[PDB]
Design an enzyme around this catalytic site. Structure first.
Site, PDB file in Angstrom:
ATOM      1  N   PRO A   1     101.976  72.870 -44.467  1.00  0.00           N
ATOM      2  CA  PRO A   1     101.538  72.298 -45.735  1.00  0.00           C
ATOM      3  C   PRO A   1     102.517  72.740 -46.823  1.00  0.00           C
ATOM      4  O   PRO A   1     102.616  73.925 -47.151  1.00  0.00           O
ATOM      5  CB  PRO A   1     100.112  72.798 -45.828  1.00  0.00           C
ATOM      6  CG  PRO A   1      99.648  72.726 -44.375  1.00  0.00           C
ATOM      7  CD  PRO A   1     100.882  72.905 -43.506  1.00  0.00           C
ATOM      8  N   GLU A   2     103.230  71.710 -47.271  1.00  0.00           N
ATOM      9  CA  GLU A   2     104.237  71.884 -48.332  1.00  0.00           C
ATOM     10  C   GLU A   2     103.726  71.397 -49.676  1.00  0.00           C
ATOM     11  O   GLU A   2     102.528  71.127 -49.814  1.00  0.00           O
ATOM     12  CB  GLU A   2     105.538  71.172 -47.893  1.00  0.00           C
ATOM     13  CG  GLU A   2     105.910  71.622 -46.478  1.00  0.00           C
ATOM     14  CD  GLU A   2     107.283  71.257 -45.965  1.00  0.00           C
ATOM     15  OE1 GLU A   2     108.125  70.705 -46.698  1.00  0.00           O
ATOM     16  OE2 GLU A   2     107.520  71.537 -44.759  1.00  0.00           O
ATOM     17  N   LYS A  52     103.618  75.473 -53.666  1.00  0.00           N
ATOM     18  CA  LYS A  52     102.540  75.709 -52.710  1.00  0.00           C
ATOM     19  C   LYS A  52     101.537  76.725 -53.228  1.00  0.00           C
ATOM     20  O   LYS A  52     100.557  77.017 -52.536  1.00  0.00           O
ATOM     21  CB  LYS A  52     103.151  76.158 -51.375  1.00  0.00           C
ATOM     22  CG  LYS A  52     103.842  74.992 -50.647  1.00  0.00           C
ATOM     23  CD  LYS A  52     104.932  75.510 -49.690  1.00  0.00           C
ATOM     24  CE  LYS A  52     106.334  75.063 -50.160  1.00  0.00           C
ATOM     25  NZ  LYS A  52     107.375  75.620 -49.236  1.00  0.00           N
ATOM     26  N   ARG A 244     114.204  79.069 -38.909  1.00  0.00           N
ATOM     27  CA  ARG A 244     113.152  78.063 -38.828  1.00  0.00           C
ATOM     28  C   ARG A 244     113.655  76.902 -37.966  1.00  0.00           C
ATOM     29  O   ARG A 244     114.879  76.691 -37.845  1.00  0.00           O
ATOM     30  CB  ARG A 244     112.832  77.590 -40.251  1.00  0.00           C
ATOM     31  CG  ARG A 244     112.555  78.728 -41.245  1.00  0.00           C
ATOM     32  CD  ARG A 244     111.162  79.332 -41.059  1.00  0.00           C
ATOM     33  NE  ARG A 244     110.119  78.342 -41.243  1.00  0.00           N
ATOM     34  CZ  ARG A 244     109.654  77.866 -42.401  1.00  0.00           C
ATOM     35  NH1 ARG A 244     110.139  78.305 -43.575  1.00  0.00           N
ATOM     36  NH2 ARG A 244     108.691  76.937 -42.339  1.00  0.00           N
TER      37      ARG A 244
END
Ligand SMILES: [Zn+2]
Length: 254
Positions: A1-2, A52, A244
């Site tokens: 969730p960005e 965020k 990542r």
DNA sequence: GGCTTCATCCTG
DNA sequence: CAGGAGAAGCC
């Protein structure tokens, strides 16, 4: 969730309980329990987001700070309902008809007004890509500024001090849109490429925010390793970048 | 600034 | 069950 998903969540929180008197308030963390009686009868005035970070403002000038990291999630329920879940409940804000529930998040604190500018994350974050007052021209200036022009995009596009709200899928999708890999610096782009990047840094997050819940947003390379690139037909690869996952096309990203 | 540690959930 | 999926900690 960005940033796009957190703003969609915040919109839902507002639809559910903005303006409504709180009939119950619950926090799992011992240090927050003192605020439960204090907030009953108060109301949420607005749910602000800065990337965020989600800022639930109350009518007594307190603000709940919460950051979901990789695992937190809000749920909207009818009051008194709680669908079975094995996630750990961390916050409940209840009104006469709707309740909002924060599960799993571990970064939750109550802020005084002064702390809205001094909290370590709030003090560090850059301009938010979903802020309609932020323009491609200001983003271009930021890319070319002394502070950022020598920063490699791989880490820059995850750094919330640059632009708040970008995360890994947006990093992958914005770099593919403009044909770039992560191993470039703004100082080395031509003016056409810099302009494309400045636009994409705003337009792709805004398009995800507008239409991912719903021309509609779709991933062009994120999670599409082994699929043909829809631009050049090469097979999308998965590797790692900045510790990542990273998705890119070897035929049209350079 | 880039790497390793924290944190919770879910998968392979 | 060990390892994968946003940032706060150590230079
Ligand atoms: Zn391609």
């Amino acid at each position: 969730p960005e940033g796009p998903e957190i703003r969609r969540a915040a919109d839902n929180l507002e639809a559910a309980i903005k303006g409504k008197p709180l009939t119950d308030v619950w926090f799992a963390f011992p240090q927050l329990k003192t605020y439960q009686s204090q907030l009953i009868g108060q109301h949420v005035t607005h749910v602000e987001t800065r990337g965020k970070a989600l800022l639930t403002h109350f009518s007594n000038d307190l603000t709940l700070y919460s950051h979901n990291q990789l695992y937190g999630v809000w749920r909207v329920v009818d009051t008194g309902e709680e669908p079975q879940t094995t996630r750990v409940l961390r916050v409940k804000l209840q009104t006469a008809d709707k309740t909002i529930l924060l599960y799993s998040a571990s970064d939750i604190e109550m802020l005084r007004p002064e702390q809205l500018t001094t909290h370590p994350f709030l003090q560090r974050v850059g301009p938010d890509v979903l802020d309609p007052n932020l323009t491609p021209e200001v983003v271009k200036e930021r890319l070319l500024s002394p502070r950022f022009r020598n920063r490699q995009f791989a880490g820059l596009l995850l750094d919330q001090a640059f632009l708040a709200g970008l995360g890994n899928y947006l990093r992958v999708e914005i770099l593919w849109q403009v044909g770039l890999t992560g191993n470039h610096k703004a100082k080395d782009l031509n003016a056409a490429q810099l302009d494309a990047l400045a636009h994409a840094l705003l337009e792709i997050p805004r398009f995800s925010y507008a239409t991912r819940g719903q021309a509609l947003f779709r991933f062009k390379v994120f999670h599409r390793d082994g699929e043909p690139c829809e631009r050049c037909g090469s097979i999308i690869e998965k590797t790692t970048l900045s510790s990542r996952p990273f998705y890119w096309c070897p035929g049209c990203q350079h």
